[PDB]
Subunit: 343 residues, 4 copies
Amino acid sequence: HSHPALTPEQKKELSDIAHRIVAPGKGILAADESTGSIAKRLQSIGTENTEENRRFYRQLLLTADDRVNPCIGGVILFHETLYQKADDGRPFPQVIKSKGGVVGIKVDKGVVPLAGTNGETTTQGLDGLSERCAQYKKDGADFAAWRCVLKIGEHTPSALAIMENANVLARYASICQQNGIVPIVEPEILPDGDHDLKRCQYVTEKVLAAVYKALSDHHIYLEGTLLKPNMVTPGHACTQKYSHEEIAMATVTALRRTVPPAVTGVTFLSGGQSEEEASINLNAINKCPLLKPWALTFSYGRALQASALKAWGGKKENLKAAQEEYVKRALANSLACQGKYTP
Amino acid sequence: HSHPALTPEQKKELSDIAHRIVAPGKGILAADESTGSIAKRLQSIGTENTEENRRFYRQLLLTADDRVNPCIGGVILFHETLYQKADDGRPFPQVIKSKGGVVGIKVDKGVVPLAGTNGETTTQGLDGLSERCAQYKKDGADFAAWRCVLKIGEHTPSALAIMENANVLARYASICQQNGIVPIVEPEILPDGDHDLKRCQYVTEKVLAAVYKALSDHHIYLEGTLLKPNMVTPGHACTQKYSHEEIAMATVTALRRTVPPAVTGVTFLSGGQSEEEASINLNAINKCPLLKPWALTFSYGRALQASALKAWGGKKENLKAAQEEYVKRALANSLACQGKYTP
Amino acid sequence: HSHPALTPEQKKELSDIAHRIVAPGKGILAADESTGSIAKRLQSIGTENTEENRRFYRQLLLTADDRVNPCIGGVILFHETLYQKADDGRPFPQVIKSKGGVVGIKVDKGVVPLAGTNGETTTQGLDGLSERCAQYKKDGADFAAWRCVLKIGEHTPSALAIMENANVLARYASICQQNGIVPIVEPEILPDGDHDLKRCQYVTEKVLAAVYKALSDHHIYLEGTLLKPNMVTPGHACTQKYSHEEIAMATVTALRRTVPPAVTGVTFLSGGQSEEEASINLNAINKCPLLKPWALTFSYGRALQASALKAWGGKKENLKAAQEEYVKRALANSLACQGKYTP
Amino acid sequence: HSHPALTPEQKKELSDIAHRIVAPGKGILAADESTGSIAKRLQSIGTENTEENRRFYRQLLLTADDRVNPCIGGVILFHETLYQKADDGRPFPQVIKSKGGVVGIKVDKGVVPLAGTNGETTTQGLDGLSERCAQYKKDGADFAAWRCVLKIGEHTPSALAIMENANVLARYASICQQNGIVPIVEPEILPDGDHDLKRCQYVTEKVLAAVYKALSDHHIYLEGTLLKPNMVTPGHACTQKYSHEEIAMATVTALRRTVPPAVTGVTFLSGGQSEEEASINLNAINKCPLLKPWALTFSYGRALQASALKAWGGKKENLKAAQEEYVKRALANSLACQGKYTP
Ligand SMILES: O=C(COP(=O)(O)O)[C@@H](O)[C@H](O)[C@H](O)COP(=O)(O)O
Ligand SMILES: O=C(COP(=O)(O)O)[C@@H](O)[C@H](O)[C@H](O)COP(=O)(O)O
């Protein structure tokens, strides 16, 4: 029966925020690398994993010149970062906002093993999520991030994996919208394996269909949501080669038959793709002749920081050289999400 | 796992047929009134329900002048009719085809009561449907019709009704596509009751979501399908009044959050709407500012024949006057499905 | 909500019939071999597949001396047989009944291929099943048979196969109970393959769980039903050997964690098991130390007729020798379903 | 596919623990009243809600004379209590154990509102539950408690409520079994409302069916689990009166058609029933002529402490009088779970 989960005013707030993030030419910078995640980053460039270093590396990205402004409609931060400040004592959420970006916050607590499965998982973080979202909202966050991981293999993703992960994404999304936070559903399908393009498109189609059915069961406002899916590509170990147009067609197709037009936008994850690779693919996708009723932009992390982190190396004197690489990719991906990339 | 239900060639055939039916400005004429259905029609105009009369009334519609050609992309026939001929010994499927229309055939066998429910039902017709489709395909049919009925009330549509009806529509759709027949999924939600616009949009959204999840589970090719849903409107007995723009917004909205863009088209059912009423609403719908990734056309029966049948009255001398009323509505609805309706 | 599918009087009738069939020491004789099924039988013994021969072979079994009376609580017949008569012009349903047996009728119309699957199927026969059941009930039938086939392989039974087959079994069961016919749910899992005991128990557990969840969704009266499942055994081509106690434990276990105690009884199918083999296994099952809240009897066909058909060979003079083999197995299985078999 | 969630040794440990708790004549004492729960208790008897008072009241129950030993097979504690000690510095888990009881621990974190529903909820507590269970196991706990609340009303329990609550109970159960903790599934259906016995039995049957289907999907070992359901009774505000035999029949029936015989036992919750009332009903239930393949015992809180708490009143001098009332109810319920009660 009709028992509204959201009021017209609440729907407007969520829809407004969602559109802002994926506005034309705009994308998302994923700087939510968790503890163990960012640790490896700083490691690859002989840099002590200290809170100060993390605060510096983050400030480095969030303070890049204004050339990045029209390219970044949103940036995801980890809990720690959301409460750090720039050298001028300015809170990071303020830095981002001052540059026209929307502040996002990762609210999930990592994946957990699914018993009785073949190395499959689901993710936690629902406990006290409501009050957490109410706080984050007060502290400048307007959208959240929650990653679910699925993988292609012999008997995976299993029916349990798909069903459980889809249900948890809906619970998370539900709680988010209750606190004025735009939830970004992220049902990532690992690119690991030797499977081909077809297998990926198939699993993506099945997974995405289950995801939105769950979202419907939990009464979630699609307009006030975003989707962070994997692009459709062959396994990393696949022997067969495919073109950028082929993965672009497979991607848009898989999305066309599963993602309702009501969904405000799609912010792809680079999932192990090189900076250039992820940009070209995003461009191809936006070039696909088919009809796309939702924004097809980016939500990259490594594909946006790889070069930067490298140019940084931990040396403070390398601040400019590092930021230049980032602004470079941001500009590159701002065009791609418009189908104008031209390297 | 990847076990193709359709080949690329099979998908092309189905997609091609689907697009033909809903090509710009084109709609569908529902002349599949069954035995007891068409019986009441002929009754309302003091006319014996004889096979010859039915053959005449049908010929009357299928032979209207060429003004109807660009307006009719498809017409659904009942079994009997599919094997009848025009006065010139020309098979009806040939008449339709010669005018550029695609021939459709109703394959369901009516609704059956769902035990343990409050007057709810599901529909049968799956037995030997495959061989039936193979035959119909050979005899000129390219798409099929199967109607499922749902109704809004205290505890209806129940979870069983929605789940069962959605599953049967998928089985039907699956068998159709296996025989080169484009299945038109028709999950009609009766307009009966005193419920309002909101209640209808809610039930439509929930029902449509279940429908496409089932279609996905049964591996059906969305591009090779059409959707024949009810427009979103208040109950027939609703006290509150709504405008054509209001039902147009409620309709497009309900569709935007449930119907994947891959679906080639949506052919609305008039469901008790007057000829004019159904035309204006279809126009409003196509006028809705929102983004519509699928064709929003018509699949009317009464809203296309009401006046004709009346002008006919059984008198053969009234052939011209009758056909004129039909051509009138066909032209009226061809514009509407383009958002250009006049008064 | 509470909308009774059955009245107390209707539930009593169904429960009563169900208990009668599986009363202590009683089992079921499956003589519902269809057209192509019984054809091979008569073939193996150089006998023309004529209606008269079928009528004779059937009469041969249904007229065996009274020693079989306490052993047979029910016998399933094919449509044809249900309307045939014994040499004395006595209708077969009357013969069976006069011997204290309940008459059953197969109402399904065979399996159909499931598109998009690896050789998987579902079964049809729901069309006009209601009126069919009303007739059969009038003509002496009190319970029905409907076989669904599932098979173990790489990716089978698939989620579609399990879900579809479980739903159809529920629709069938629902219609049956509406017409005073006790439905026997038969979710057979082919023993084909080289899988082991564990794999079978696993699939059986998963399949059986889905079956009863569907039965619940369709509001079916468990007490007024029976279950005709496959025993838990290794694939026919399995390399590993198992004892009668091992398959008995695997069987009872798989049933204990899926079959609600409300289910009046379980009538196992022999599924390619030799006459002796099926008897010993049924005995072991009834000997299992675990707690069994339902009757664990038989519903054999070949395991009950193999020897008979052979001793017959088509020769009318062999009537006695043939019936003796049948009575032999019936007596053998009457003990087994009591755990008193005496090899 | 076959990917064992539990080893034979793990299954044995869980099954063993489960049987111990519900051994003949034994029941469970629910002393897991949370913070706000036990607060009201101490309030009703003018007693400051201090940790010392709670420690005393708990010690009071866990140290009752040995007459309670054969009556208590298990007792559930709240986190705090699990780490408190008796006056002799003996850890509570040790007190319980020394008396032959199994120690249980509530691991859920309360109910949370389900958005888009009519006051419906689900419960949280899955985050870090694994490590929590590993710790509790080390600290003497062998089984856990997790309460899900459902309620009967106009459109409740809704499909979302039933589906979500059933899935969370399965996740909880899954994690528990991975850490050698026997999970007790508690899908409580509030007795609030003016509904009758029939409505309750219906909802209980539907809810219980969904619960076990979920448990199956998550591959949980039924033998290593217990069920804490509500007895089937009319709403608290129901106008119609029923006998103890009537609710006993409705209860056993609802359980017979939903709870697999593999489930080791059922520990009913008193849910607002008076001490006497809960005892008589438990007796009637065990007196029901129907077949019960699982233990039908108790898991009471108020129905076991009501009189005690009252006789205590906070006064230390009232220790004996208080414990006597508890031992009284424990003895009363030990008989009831055996069908030998006799007021
Ligand atoms: O003819 C129709 C044309 O539109 P569709 O809904 O078929 O598309 C509709 O108007 C329905 O048939 C109408 O409800 C007839 O119901 P009836 O009066 O016979 O009891
Ligand atoms: O007759 C039977 C008796 O037991 P039920 O399984 O019917 O209970 C079974 O033995 C099956 O019909 C058998 O697999 C026949 O298959 P077929 O050789 O014709 O290809």
